[PDB]
Design a protein around this motif. Structure first.
Motif, PDB file in Angstrom:
ATOM      1  N   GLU A 184       0.806  -1.223   0.000  1.00 21.24           N
ATOM      2  CA  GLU A 184       0.000   0.000   0.000  1.00 21.24           C
ATOM      3  C   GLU A 184       0.839   1.275   0.000  1.00 21.24           C
ATOM      4  O   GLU A 184       1.951   1.304   0.529  1.00 21.24           O
ATOM      5  N   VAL A 185       0.288   2.351  -0.553  1.00 18.69           N
ATOM      6  CA  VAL A 185       0.997   3.626  -0.548  1.00 18.69           C
ATOM      7  C   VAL A 185       0.208   4.703   0.197  1.00 18.69           C
ATOM      8  O   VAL A 185      -0.967   4.938  -0.088  1.00 18.69           O
ATOM      9  N   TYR A 186       0.871   5.341   1.159  1.00 19.63           N
ATOM     10  CA  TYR A 186       0.277   6.369   2.008  1.00 19.63           C
ATOM     11  C   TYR A 186       0.962   7.736   1.963  1.00 19.63           C
ATOM     12  O   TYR A 186       2.005   7.913   2.585  1.00 19.63           O
ATOM     13  N   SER A 237      -1.209   7.814  -1.834  1.00 14.54           N
ATOM     14  CA  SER A 237      -0.918   7.501  -3.229  1.00 14.54           C
ATOM     15  C   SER A 237      -0.815   8.776  -4.063  1.00 14.54           C
ATOM     16  O   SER A 237      -0.333   8.760  -5.199  1.00 14.54           O
ATOM     17  N   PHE A 259       6.218  10.170   1.190  1.00 14.74           N
ATOM     18  CA  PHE A 259       5.107   9.226   1.217  1.00 14.74           C
ATOM     19  C   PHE A 259       5.603   7.931   1.823  1.00 14.74           C
ATOM     20  O   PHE A 259       6.790   7.621   1.760  1.00 14.74           O
ATOM     21  N   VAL A 282       5.607   3.767   2.123  1.00 17.34           N
ATOM     22  CA  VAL A 282       5.286   2.538   1.438  1.00 17.34           C
ATOM     23  C   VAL A 282       5.263   1.409   2.438  1.00 17.34           C
ATOM     24  O   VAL A 282       6.246   1.152   3.138  1.00 17.34           O
ATOM     25  N   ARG A 314       1.839  -1.817  -6.988  1.00 16.89           N
ATOM     26  CA  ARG A 314       0.861  -0.756  -6.834  1.00 16.89           C
ATOM     27  C   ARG A 314       1.354   0.487  -7.540  1.00 16.89           C
ATOM     28  O   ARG A 314       2.559   0.694  -7.687  1.00 16.89           O
ATOM     29  N   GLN A 315       0.435   1.322  -7.988  1.00 20.58           N
ATOM     30  CA  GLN A 315       0.849   2.572  -8.591  1.00 20.58           C
ATOM     31  C   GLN A 315       0.566   3.745  -7.688  1.00 20.58           C
ATOM     32  O   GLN A 315      -0.483   3.821  -7.048  1.00 20.58           O
ATOM     33  N   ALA A 316       1.485   4.688  -7.703  1.00 24.70           N
ATOM     34  CA  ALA A 316       1.290   5.972  -7.065  1.00 24.70           C
ATOM     35  C   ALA A 316       1.359   7.002  -8.168  1.00 24.70           C
ATOM     36  O   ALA A 316       1.968   6.752  -9.208  1.00 24.70           O
ATOM     37  N   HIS A 317       0.723   8.141  -8.002  1.00 26.08           N
ATOM     38  CA  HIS A 317       0.722   9.062  -9.127  1.00 26.08           C
ATOM     39  C   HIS A 317       1.260  10.420  -8.780  1.00 26.08           C
ATOM     40  O   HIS A 317       0.963  10.971  -7.716  1.00 26.08           O
TER      41      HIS A 317
END
Ligand SMILES: *[C@@H]1O[C@H](CO)[C@@H](O[C@@H]2O[C@H](CO)[C@@H](O[C@@H]3O[C@H](CO[C@H]4O[C@H](CO)[C@@H](O)[C@H](O)[C@@H]4O)[C@@H](O)[C@H](O[C@H]4O[C@H](CO)[C@@H](O)[C@H](O)[C@@H]4O[C@H]4O[C@H](CO)[C@@H](O)[C@H](O)[C@@H]4O)[C@@H]3O)[C@H](O)[C@H]2NC(C)=O)[C@H](O)[C@H]1NC(C)=O
Ligand SMILES: *[C@@H]1O[C@H](CO)[C@@H](O[C@@H]2O[C@H](CO)[C@@H](O)[C@H](O)[C@H]2NC(C)=O)[C@H](O)[C@H]1NC(C)=O
Ligand SMILES: *[C@@H]1O[C@H](CO)[C@@H](O[C@@H]2O[C@H](CO)[C@@H](O)[C@H](O)[C@H]2NC(C)=O)[C@H](O)[C@H]1NC(C)=O
Ligand SMILES: *[C@@H]1O[C@H](CO)[C@@H](O[C@@H]2O[C@H](CO)[C@@H](O)[C@H](O)[C@H]2NC(C)=O)[C@H](O)[C@H]1NC(C)=O
Ligand SMILES: *[C@@H]1O[C@H](CO)[C@@H](O[C@@H]2O[C@H](CO)[C@@H](O)[C@H](O)[C@H]2NC(C)=O)[C@H](O)[C@H]1NC(C)=O
Ligand SMILES: *[C@@H]1O[C@H](CO)[C@@H](O)[C@H](O)[C@H]1NC(C)=O
Ligand SMILES: *[C@@H]1O[C@H](CO)[C@@H](O)[C@H](O)[C@H]1NC(C)=O
Ligand SMILES: *[C@@H]1O[C@H](CO)[C@@H](O)[C@H](O)[C@H]1NC(C)=O
Ligand SMILES: [Ca+2]
Ligand SMILES: [Ca+2]
Ligand SMILES: [Ca+2]
Ligand SMILES: [Ca+2]
Ligand SMILES: [Ca+2]
Ligand SMILES: [Mg+2]
Lengths: 117, 593, 359, 115
Positions: free
Chosen positions: B448-450, B452, B473, B475, B588-591
């Protein structure tokens, strides 16, 4: 040693008639061959004219020997076999013998054909 | 996928005996130890005057690896009359077909001959020896007064056998009635109880059998191969029988009612001389509670683009549905003249995925025609046509191909780990090899990304050393895992996390972990199976607006994990395997905004 | 990418070019036309492989009329006609034959007729120009027997096809293998019943004209049988008297190059069957390619004189003298990684293509 | 063409031994058995014995034993029937024959008379 019974020993015929004679055996002559249910009968018929050696007509109680006129038909199974001559000729006045080959070879009594007069 | 093919147990017998011709397992109700049953049909016995009589050996497993013969028959040929032998056990091929139901061992000699009372002859009637408890009896359902080719004289009873869950024995005797073939089935209780060694012909009361028919069915060999299973929903295992020359050598498989022998089904092959019905088996392969039908056709020729025929071998697979109908599909082999489908051996749920699996042999395939065994996993839609594991013979031919996979038996757990094992014969080299199944680990891998949502403006934390502010951020990732059988409580995992690695090498990676200013990190994790997910969190940041190729790209967050495979083993050195139907590579993707 | 057609002296009369060399690159294709032009008045080698189990007795006796009559008829179809002869029954093992000491001695229950010992395959007469020898080889042929109806036809055929140095097949000839029976044949896996689980290696195993591995090796598969028949350029003709004819007829699609007809119940058409089968075979032209080159695929289409097109091994029909059939051969390359052979089925001449890759 | 040639008539006394020959031609002699059949003067045929030239071993009928022996001379494609201790009931024509169905043959027969 299989006993063959052949009858009648004296058969009255006339040219053009259908002539029949029979042979019976003390045991089945039907053996195991190259076919499953279509077993062969170890029986053959011979024609012997007076003063001559005998000639083979029919073998396996059905198949005719090459050169045999298509009027000599053998048939039967088990312990009861027959020979029928269609349109018997004056040249067929011979003594017929049946021979079995299921085990020890043996011949029947002989059936003599004579013309009716 | 989980079969251990790296450290199998190898057994061997006397040269030329065809040791390994037929294999099964012996599992007494209360022995606490299992044995293998390995046949050797051409073995030289100690019996007084019998040459290459054949034998069946009981092989151990724990401790050492040694096999010893079972004394089903410890005598020679009985006399009928002075100086007139009743029976001919020479070259009888005893052990050609062996099956066992827990304690009950049924071993047959399909080439056994006898004279019959009426006259001297040598009829290949066939006999079997059934052992249970502390008693062994001779069973010979075709050794009767119905003799010669139009009777049971050429039956070869015991040619192919199986057991019915009702404690009945099913014997295929393909030579009955001019090779129309006959199935005979009887009860174990009747066979053992109604036994008298002084009687050649024995009648049984609860015996079922097929009957002779018209000559058009001659040379079909019904009962060439048999199997059992419930095909009508009556709670009674029915009888499955291969008939390879049926229907103008298209080959057929018949299913007979296990209670009254009424015919239930007729499966017909499509290609002449494919020898459909060579080997038959039944098992639930899709979790539908109905037995499914597996039929080999080892000589099947598959046409290529120009119509060229390649002999490969084919297996027909059909699922049983509640309506009484079958759903048919087809599986082709992989190698020419390998004879794929020569042996179908259900493995049970070997990979413990909820569906039974099947091993299919191709005894003449592989390098030097050593032989190949293909393992196909099951699923809710039927057998998976794509193999997940391939086994190969490990021996060279000495006079004939090892024929690895010629005969196989699975679904028996020997190493007691909850994952059923598999025995594969290779009689061409007089060997048998036992493979054991590895435990399977299913891994729940979270990533998960916190947040994203990340950008170049929202600078929220400072870097170590020099307190520069960056956009940060977090990870996170975590792991939980378990299996269904016997696994080590502590699993040793290797995990590596990469940031923004999904691009051309030499390009600038934008996301770095701030503690090391690096786009990569790995950790050594110890995870208790069946426990809590073990989590970790790293803080990542974006390069500032001075070190970049672009500003607006997706960021790939990639997690890869694997097992250690050094400490990951049980007490016998058997290592677990990660489920091969699940990814161990997730992302997972982050943008970037 | 190119195709090279040699301008060197050719060594083929029917198939040309008999040698092609091409250069491919991945994604490339190249093609050429291969010409097939059948000859008239061939040298012909006809070998009689006869089923001599007991049910054939009444057909075998008719082979005594074949030698001179067939030789005369073939005078209008061939230039040099030779006859050979051999026979087969079955595998001499239980349960196919009796193994009792007294029954095996006579090999039948008939005490009138003397049956010969059973055998797998025996070569009797090498292919020869001498018609009298053919008739004599037949005249003294005794009948045998067995228990099971099906026969070891395919096993005998393989040995007859493979053992070239023993049969005397000529390279410079149209090779015809005539199989005479009335029953169906055993299949490769039928041998399990006899305890024979050893695969047929496809080799020649004759000693003194006798096949000696017949009791240790199983029957060949149809796959193996067609492979060897095509490889040895042999055109098989089946002559079947019984209803079993249809069994053989429907296997023809599985045995390329094979033809079959019926024997009349009187066996009066033994020579007519051979002549008609020959005339049909000479007019059927089809090719196949043996491709062992990895990464390379072939697509061949027959272009017929009548304007039709027939892909792959389908070939062209009703081909006559002074009549060429053209085969359009396209080779496509999928990947980098030798030669392949393109040949008419049943012909002695072949075309070899060498495929180079510049990678 | 298959032929069988037999010896001519014999005039024997009681207790004497007669050797009746049959010469074969036109075929592979050693590949077929030869049969002997007795034809009494006015009765039907009775099979006597066979000799399998493949092995040289004879077989006799249950009745025709002891006084009857059969032997071969393969070097000249011929066979012999030897009848020992001739009795008056042995007067008959003795024939040699080939019994293969598609290739049979009977000889002319040898006339034997016993005083
Ligand atoms: C899967 O496929 C198999 C076939 O491979 C199929 O089994 C076959 O079923 C048929 C019947 O449908 C069997 O054929 C015969 O059936 C009759 C039953 O009588 C009824 O039907 C006939 C019409 O056929 C009516 O005339 C009659 O009035 C009834 O309605 C049986 O009586 C037959 O038995 C014969 O053989 C016996 C051998 O012991 C003899 O004792 C008996 O007298 C019969 O002999 C007949 O033929 C002889 C010549 O051969 C002749 O001399 C006699 O006088 C007599 O006419 C016979 O069984 C066929 O045999 C079955 N085949 C096999 C191999 O079992 C399955 O049903 C099918 N299953 C599914 C699920 O589809
Ligand atoms: C079982 O024993 C038989 C008898 O000794 C072996 O067969 C013999 O092999 C020798 C060569 O080593 C031959 O000279 C004999 O003639 C053979 N005898 C027979 C009766 O075949 C046979 O190989 C042994 N089999 C096994 C598996 O040990
Ligand atoms: C064709 O074969 C026949 C049969 O063997 C040959 O004729 C034989 O010739 C030999 C002499 O070498 C004689 O002793 C035989 O008696 C002849 N047999 C018959 C049946 O006539 C014939 O010479 C051969 N011809 C050719 C050209 O090879
Ligand atoms: C293929 O078969 C043909 C026909 O038999 C062979 O062509 C003949 O070869 C002989 C020997 O050199 C010549 O005497 C003939 O004149 C040729 N016939 C024609 C019509 O030209 C051909 O040589 C064989 N080819 C191969 C490769 O075996
Ligand atoms: C053999 O096949 C080739 C194709 O592989 C034919 O050539 C093509 O002809 C069509 C016109 O009908 C053109 O549109 C294609 O571009 C051509 N392709 C190539 C690769 O040249 C060729 O004509 C055929 N030859 C014969 C005799 O039929
Ligand atoms: C066999 O038992 C089933 C039970 O469902 C019945 O329907 C069928 O008719 C029976 N067949 C015979 C031949 O008794
Ligand atoms: C061969 O060419 C024909 C005609 O264009 C085409 O339909 C066929 O699919 C091709 N086959 C292969 C294997 O490429
Ligand atoms: C086609 O074959 C038939 C014989 O079946 C023949 O009569 C006809 O003339 C042939 N046609 C051509 C164009 O060769
Ligand atoms: Ca049931
Ligand atoms: Ca199911
Ligand atoms: Ca599973
Ligand atoms: Ca296990
Ligand atoms: Ca047979
Ligand atoms: Mg036959």
């Amino acid at each position: 040693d299989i006993v063959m019974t052949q009858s009648p020993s004296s058969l009255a015929v006339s040219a053009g008639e259908k002539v029949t004679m029979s042979c019976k055996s003390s045991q089945s002559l039907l053996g195991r061959g190259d076919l499953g249910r279509l077993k062969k009968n170890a029986l053959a018929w011979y024609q012997q004219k007076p003063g001559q050696s005998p000639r083979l007509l029919i073998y396996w109680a059905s198949t005719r020997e090459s050169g045999v006129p298509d009027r000599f038909t053998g048939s039967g199974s088990g312990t009861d076999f027959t020979l029928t001559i269609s349109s018997v000729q004056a040249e067929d006045l011979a003594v017929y013998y049946c021979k079995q080959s299921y085990n020890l070879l043996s011949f029947g009594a002989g059936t003599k054909l004579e013309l009716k007069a | 996928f989980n079969l251990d093919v790296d450290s199998p147990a190898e057994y061997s017998g006397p040269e030329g005996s065809y040791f390994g011709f037929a294999v099964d397992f012996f599992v007494p109700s209360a022995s606490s130890r299992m044995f293998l049953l390995v046949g050797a049909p051409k073995a030289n016995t100690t019996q007084p005057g019998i040459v290459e009589g054949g034998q069946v050996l009981k092989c151990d497993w724990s401790s050492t690896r040694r096999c010893q013969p079972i004394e089903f028959d410890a005598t020679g040929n009985r006399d009928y009359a002075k100086d007139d032998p009743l029976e001919f056990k020479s070259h009888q091929w005893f052990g050609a077909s062996v099956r066992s139901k827990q304690d009950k061992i049924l071993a047959c000699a399909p080439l056994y001959h006898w004279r019959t009372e009426m006259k001297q002859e040598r009829e290949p009637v066939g006999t079997c020896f059934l052992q249970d408890g502390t008693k062994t009896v001779e069973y010979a359902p075709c050794r009767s007064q119905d003799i010669d080719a139009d009777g049971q004289g050429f039956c070869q009873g015991g040619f192919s056998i199986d057991f019915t869950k009702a404690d009945r024995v099913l014997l295929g005797g393909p030579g009955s009635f001019y090779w129309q073939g006959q199935l005979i089935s009887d009860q174990v209780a009747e066979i053992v109880s109604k036994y008298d060694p002084n009687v050649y012909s024995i009648k049984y009361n609860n015996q079922l059998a097929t009957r002779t028919a018209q000559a058009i069915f001659d040379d079909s060999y019904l009962g060439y191969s048999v199997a059992v299973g419930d095909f009508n929903g009556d709670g009674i295992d029915d009888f499955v029988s291969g008939v390879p020359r049926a229907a103008r050598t298209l080959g057929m498989v018949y299913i007979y009612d296990g209670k009254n022998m009424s015919s239930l089904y007729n499966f017909t092959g499509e290609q002449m001389a494919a020898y459909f019905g060579f080997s038959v088996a039944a098992t639930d392969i899709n979790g539908d509670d109905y037995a499914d039908v597996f039929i080999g056709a080892p000589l099947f020729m598959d046409r290529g683009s120009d119509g060229k025929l390649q002999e490969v071998g084919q297996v027909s697979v059909s699922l049983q549905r509640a309506s009484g109908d079958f759903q048919t599909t087809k599986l082709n082999g992989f190698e020419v003249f390998a004879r794929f489908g020569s042996a179908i051996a259900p493995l049970g749920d070997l990979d413990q995925d909820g569906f039974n699996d099947i091993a299919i042999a191709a005894p003449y395939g592989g390098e030097d025609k050593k032989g190949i065994v293909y393992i196909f996993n099951g699923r809710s839609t039927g057998l998976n046509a794509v193999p997940s594991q391939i086994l190969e013979g490990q021996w060279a031919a000495r006079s004939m191909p090892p024929s690895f996979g010629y005969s196989m038996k699975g679904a028996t757990d020997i190493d007691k780990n909850g994952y059923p094992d598999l025995i594969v014969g290779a009689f061409g080299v007089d060997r048998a090899i036992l493979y054991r199944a590895r435990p399977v680990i299913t891994v729940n891998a979270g990533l998960e990304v916190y947040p994203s949502i990340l950008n170049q403006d929202n600078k929220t934390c400072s870097l170590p050393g020099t307190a520069l502010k960056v956009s940060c951020f977090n990870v996170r990732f975590c792991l939980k895992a378990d299996g269904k059988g016997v696994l080590p409580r502590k699993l040793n995992f290797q995990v590596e996390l990469l940031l923004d690695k999904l691009k051309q090498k030499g390009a600038i990676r934008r996301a770095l972990f701030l503690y090391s200013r690096s786009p990569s990190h790995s950790k050594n994790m110890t995870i208790s199976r069946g426990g809590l997910m073990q989590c970790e969190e790293l803080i990542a940041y974006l390069r500032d607006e001075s070190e970049f190729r672009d500003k607006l790209t997706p960021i790939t967050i990639f997690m890869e994990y694997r097992l250690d495979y050094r400490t990951a083993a049980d007490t016998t050195g058997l290592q677990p395997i990660l489920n091969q139907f699940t990814p161990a590579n997730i992302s997972r993707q982050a943008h970037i905004l | 990418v190119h195709v090279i057609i040699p301008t060197e002296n050719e060594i083929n009369t029917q198939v040309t070019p008999g040698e092609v060399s091409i250069q491919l690159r991945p994604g490339a294709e190249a093609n050429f036309m291969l010409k097939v032009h059948p000859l008239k008045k061939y040298p012909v080698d006809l070998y009689y492989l006869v089923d001599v189990s007991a049910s054939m007795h009444n057909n075998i006796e008719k082979l005594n009329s074949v030698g001179n009559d067939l030789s005369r008829k073939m005078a209008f179809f061939s230039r040099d006609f030779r006859l050979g002869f051999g026979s087969y029954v079955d595998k001499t093992v239980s349960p196919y034959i009796s193994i009792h000491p007294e029954r095996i001695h006579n090999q039948c229950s008939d005490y009138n007729l003397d049956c010969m010992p059973p055998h797998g395959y025996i070569h009797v007469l090498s292919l020869t120009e001498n018609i009298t020898e053919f008739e004599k080889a037949v005249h003294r042929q005794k009948i045998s027997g067995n228990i099971d109806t099906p026969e070891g036809g395919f096993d005998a055929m393989l040995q007859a096809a493979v053992c070239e140095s023993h049969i005397g097949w000529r390279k410079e000839a149209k090779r015809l293998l005539l199989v005479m029976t009335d029953q169906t044949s055993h299949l490769a896996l039928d041998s399990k019943l006899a305890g024979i689980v050893v695969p047929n290696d496809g080799n020649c195993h004759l000693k003194n004209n006798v096949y000696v591995k017949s009791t240790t090796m199983e029957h060949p598969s149809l796959g193996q049988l067609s492979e060897k028949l095509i490889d040895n350029n042999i055109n098989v003709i089946f002559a079947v008297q019984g209803k079993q004819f249809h069994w053989y007829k429907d296997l023809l699609p599985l045995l390329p190059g094979t033809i079959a007809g019926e024997i009349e119940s009187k066996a009066a058409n033994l020579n007519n069957l051979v002549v008609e089968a020959y005339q049909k075979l000479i007019s059927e032209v089809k090719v196949q390619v043996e491709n062992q080159v990895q990464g390379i695929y072939f697509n061949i289409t027959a272009i017929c004189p009548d304007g039709s097109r027939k892909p792959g091994m389908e070939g062209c029909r009703n081909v006559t003298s002074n009549d060429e059939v053209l085969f359009n051969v396209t080779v496509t390359m999928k990947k980098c990684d030798n030669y392949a052979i393109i040949k008419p089925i049943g012909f002695n001449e072949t075309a070899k293509i060498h495929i180079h890759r510049n990678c | 063409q298959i032929q069988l040639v037999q010896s001519g008539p014999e005039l024997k006394k009681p207790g004497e031994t007669v050797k009746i020959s049959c010469k074969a031609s036109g075929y592979t002699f050693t590949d077929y058995s030869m049969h002997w059949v007795k034809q009494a003067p006015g009765k039907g045929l009775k099979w006597v014995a066979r000799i399998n030239t493949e092995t040289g071993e004879p077989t006799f009928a249950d009745d025709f034993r002891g006084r009857f022996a059969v032997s071969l001379e393969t070097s000249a494609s011929t066979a012999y029937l030897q009848i020992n201790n001739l009795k008056n009931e042995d007067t008959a024509t003795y024939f040699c024959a080939i019994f293969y169905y598609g290739r049979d043959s009977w000889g002319q027969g040898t006339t034997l008379t016993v005083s």
